[PDB]
Design an enzyme around this catalytic site. Structure first.
Site, short mmCIF file in Angstrom:
data_model
loop_
_atom_site.label_atom_id
_atom_site.label_comp_id
_atom_site.label_asym_id
_atom_site.label_seq_id
_atom_site.Cartn_x
_atom_site.Cartn_y
_atom_site.Cartn_z
N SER A 49 -22.72 -14.07 -26.14
CA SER A 49 -21.30 -13.96 -26.43
C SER A 49 -20.57 -12.91 -25.59
O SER A 49 -19.34 -12.79 -25.75
CB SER A 49 -21.05 -13.72 -27.92
OG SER A 49 -21.15 -14.93 -28.64
N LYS A 52 -17.63 -14.54 -24.07
CA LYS A 52 -16.33 -14.71 -24.72
C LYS A 52 -15.21 -14.02 -23.96
O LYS A 52 -14.07 -14.48 -23.99
CB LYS A 52 -16.36 -14.18 -26.16
CG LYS A 52 -17.12 -15.03 -27.15
CD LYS A 52 -16.79 -14.54 -28.57
CE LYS A 52 -17.55 -15.24 -29.66
NZ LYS A 52 -17.20 -14.62 -30.97
N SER A 85 -19.11 -12.92 -35.61
CA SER A 85 -20.35 -13.61 -35.28
C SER A 85 -20.35 -15.00 -35.89
O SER A 85 -19.84 -15.21 -36.99
CB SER A 85 -21.55 -12.83 -35.84
OG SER A 85 -21.48 -11.45 -35.51
N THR A 176 -20.45 -7.40 -27.97
CA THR A 176 -21.87 -7.63 -28.22
C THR A 176 -22.26 -9.06 -27.84
O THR A 176 -21.44 -9.98 -27.81
CB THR A 176 -22.18 -7.44 -29.70
OG1 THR A 176 -21.28 -8.24 -30.47
CG2 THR A 176 -22.06 -5.96 -30.13
N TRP A 178 -26.04 -11.63 -28.39
CA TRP A 178 -27.43 -11.74 -28.81
C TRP A 178 -27.82 -13.20 -28.63
O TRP A 178 -27.31 -14.06 -29.36
CB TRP A 178 -27.59 -11.32 -30.27
CG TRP A 178 -29.02 -11.20 -30.77
CD1 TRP A 178 -30.15 -11.79 -30.24
CD2 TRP A 178 -29.46 -10.48 -31.92
NE1 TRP A 178 -31.26 -11.46 -30.98
CE2 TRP A 178 -30.86 -10.66 -32.02
CE3 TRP A 178 -28.81 -9.69 -32.88
CZ2 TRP A 178 -31.62 -10.07 -33.04
CZ3 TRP A 178 -29.55 -9.11 -33.88
CH2 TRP A 178 -30.95 -9.30 -33.96
N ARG A 218 -27.85 -2.15 -31.20
CA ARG A 218 -27.27 -2.00 -29.87
C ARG A 218 -26.24 -0.88 -29.85
O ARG A 218 -26.28 0.00 -28.98
CB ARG A 218 -26.67 -3.33 -29.41
CG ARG A 218 -27.72 -4.45 -29.30
CD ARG A 218 -27.12 -5.83 -29.41
NE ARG A 218 -26.51 -6.06 -30.72
CZ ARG A 218 -25.83 -7.15 -31.06
NH1 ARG A 218 -25.70 -8.16 -30.21
NH2 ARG A 218 -25.30 -7.23 -32.27
#
Length: 232
Positions: A49, A52, A85, A176, A178, A218
């Site tokens: 992501s 994005k 998320s 972030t 993942w 993170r």
């Protein structure tokens, strides 16, 4: 011009989490590498992501959406969906952009290997698009400085979606990522610090994830490292 920094303390931070990671720092003068697996800095990984940011730039630049549009589910804007998320807003935007425009824009920007394949709604999570941490820090530094080849207003609008935390006069922007469905799993936190006097210091954290880790690992590693480096 890409050199290991003073790394004796930060290396131990990653060791303590029993995983491999790198932290890339880009100032106006230097790129420095920290962590316990410095070869990750020049290794390509799926962006997850972190993509994005570029999806939003492309969608806004090409008028496929705007910052006020409400995406039906709660119902929310592009900016609200940036930090959340497992929301499908960004898949919908990618479909509106379409494979051909997405590939042309990704090639024009030169993001990573610039390969998006044939599936416009997941290429950032499973491939074939891959990017190194050094490339990510350079991309986000350009965004922070309004130097990407997009409208100034579009860049400002995307930057505004990326504010993570503010404290003591410092603003931390970032994103972030993942990628949990590839092996090994990849975790990202890419962004920049705006210091009180206006100076910008960009970062890209990239580490191997495991399913038991908290998502906050993170940010935890990033903040401890930025403090050790006196960036915040």
């Amino acid at each position: 011009q890409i050199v290991q920094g003073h790394n004796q303390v930060i290396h131990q931070y990653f060791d303590e989490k029993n995983t491999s990671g790198v932290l890339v720092i880009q100032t106006d003068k230097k790129i420095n590498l920290y962590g316990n697996a410095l070869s990750r800095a020049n290794t390509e990984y799926v962006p997850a992501s972190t993509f994005k940011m570029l999806n939003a730039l492309i969608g806004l630049e090409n008028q496929k959406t705007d910052i006020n549009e409400i995406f039906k589910w709660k119902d929310m804007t592009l900016g609200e969906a940036m930090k959340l998320s497992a929301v499908p807003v960004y898949q919908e935007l990618a479909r509106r952009i379409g494979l051909d425009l997405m590939q042309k824009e990704v090639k024009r920007i030169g993001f990573g290997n610039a390969e998006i394949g044939q599936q416009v709604d997941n290429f950032w999570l499973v491939g074939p698009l891959k990017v190194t941490p050094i490339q990510e820090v350079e991309f986000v530094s350009q965004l922070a400085h309004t130097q990407l080849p997009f409208s100034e207003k579009v860049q400002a609008n995307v930057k505004n979606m990326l504010l993570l935390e503010e404290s003591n006069g410092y603003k931390i922007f970032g994103k972030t990522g993942w990628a949990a469905d590839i092996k090994p799993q990849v975790g990202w936190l890419t962004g920049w610090v705006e210091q009180p006097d206006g100076k910008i210091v960009a970062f890209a954290l990239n580490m191997e994830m495991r399913s038991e880790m908290p998502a906050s690992i993170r940010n935890e590693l990033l903040m401890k490292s930025l403090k050790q480096l006196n960036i915040i």
